[PDB]
C-alpha cells in the first residue's frame, strides 16, 4: 500500500504487554479506567508502545483505543486523545523491568517524580505515592503472541 | 500479496529475544555456534519463535537463518535445516521465565529431560547437566524493538 502504511505496521510490531512486578498486566478499559489483570494475554492488556523520543513513550490500548495518561493528582486513566499527560519517561530499573513516570508531574519540593503503578491487589496506585525503588512501579514489557488475540490482528488481515 | 504472505509476516510478529536468567541473551551465530551476549538487541540475539504445537517451539536465528537445535550429547548448535533435534518443549517456570528441553532427549533412567541452558559466563551449558530448577535454564522471552535492528526488518520494507 502506501502513505501511512509503513508507520502503521511498525505500531503493530511495537505492541506489548506491560507486566507489573506486583503480579498484574496493566490494562486500559474502554470506560477509560486503568487497572490490572492477572490474566496473560488479556484483550485490553495488549498495549501498543509508541516511542515518542529518547526515554519517552506513549502507551495506547490496542483494544480500547485510548492512550494511557496520568493526571494532576497522580491518577491513571485512558485518554481518548493524546495530551501532555500521556507522555511518560521510560527508565530501566533492574532485570528488564522499566519504570514509567509522568513527563510533566513531580513533587515541587523533593523533585521526586510521579510514577505509573499498581498495588498488590491489582488496582491503580496513586502516582504521587509511588516511588522508583518500590515494586509497585516496576513494569516488564512483554511480547504479544498474536495467535492468542486474533480479534486485535485483522489489520494485516 | 499472497500464498505464503500471511504466515511470513506472523513470523516477524513472533520474533523475540531469549534472555537467560544468568545474565545473557541467547544468540545463534552464522558459524553455527550458540552462546550468550550481555548485549541487549544483539543482531544474532533476535530469534523468531515458531509455535510448532502446544508447548512446542522451534527457534530460528533471524540473522544467522539457523534453527536452534540440541544434539545427542546435550550440546546446542545452529541447524541449517529443521530436524527432530530442533523441537523444544516450552514450559512456564516462574515469573514469565520459561524452560526449554529437548523434545527427544532425556536420561533413560531418571527420565529427567535435557535442557537448553547457558552458564554464568555466557557459554552454552551441557544440556544433560542442566536442570529445570537451576537458573541456567530459565529463559524470559523478550520483545524486539525493530528500530534497534533495522537490517533485520527490510522484509515489510
Curated annotation (Swiss-Prot), chains A, B:
GO biological process: cell-cell signaling; fibroblast growth factor receptor signaling pathway; inner ear auditory receptor cell differentiation; negative regulation of neuron apoptotic process; neurogenesis; positive regulation of cell population proliferation; positive regulation of dopaminergic neuron differentiation; positive regulation of ERK1 and ERK2 cascade
Locations listed in the record: Secreted
GO molecular function per UniProt: fibroblast growth factor receptor binding; growth factor activity; heparan sulfate proteoglycan binding; receptor-receptor interaction; signaling receptor binding
Tissue-level expression: Predominantly expressed in the cerebellum.
Keyword annotations of the record: Growth factor, Secreted
The family this protein is said to belong to: Belongs to the heparin-binding growth factors family.
Disease field: Renal hypodysplasia/aplasia 2: A perinatally lethal renal disease encompassing a spectrum of kidney development defects, including renal agenesis, bilateral renal aplasia, hypoplasia, (cystic) dysplasia, and severe obstructive uropathy.
Oligomeric and partner information: Homodimer. Interacts with FGFR2 and FGFR4. Affinity between fibroblast growth factors (FGFs) and their receptors is increased by heparan sulfate glycosaminoglycans that function as coreceptors.
Name used for this protein in its record: Fibroblast growth factor 20
Taxonomic source organism: Homo sapiens
Lineage: Eukaryota, Metazoa, Chordata, Craniata, Vertebrata
Parent-record interval covered: 52 to 208 of 211
Amino acid at each position: 500500500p502506501g502513505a501511512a502504511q509503513l508507520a502503521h505496521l511498525h505500531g503493530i510490531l511495537r505492541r506489548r504487554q506491560l507486566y507489573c512486578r506486583t503480579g498484574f498486566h496493566l490494562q486500559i478499559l474502554p470506560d477509560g479506567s486503568v487497572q490490572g489483570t492477572r490474566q496473560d494475554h488479556s484483550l485490553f492488556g495488549i498495549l501498543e508502545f509508541i516511542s515518542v523520543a529518547v526515554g519517552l513513550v506513549s502507551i495506547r490500548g490496542v483494544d480500547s483505543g485510548l492512550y494511557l495518561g496520568m493526571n494532576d493528582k497522580g491518577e491513571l486513566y485512558g485518554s481518548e486523545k493524546l495530551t501532555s499527560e500521556c507522555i511518560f519517561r521510560e527508565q530501566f530499573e533492574e532485570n528488564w523491568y522499566n519504570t514509567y513516570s509522568s513527563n510533566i508531574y513531580k513533587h515541587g519540593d523533593t523533585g521526586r517524580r510521579y510514577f505509573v503503578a499498581l498495588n498488590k491487589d491489582g488496582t491503580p496506585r496513586d502516582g504521587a505515592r509511588s516511588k522508583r525503588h518500590q515494586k509497585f512501579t516496576h513494569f516488564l514489557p512483554r511480547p504479544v503472541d498474536p495467535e492468542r488475540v486474533p480479534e486485535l490482528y485483522k489489520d494485516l488481515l
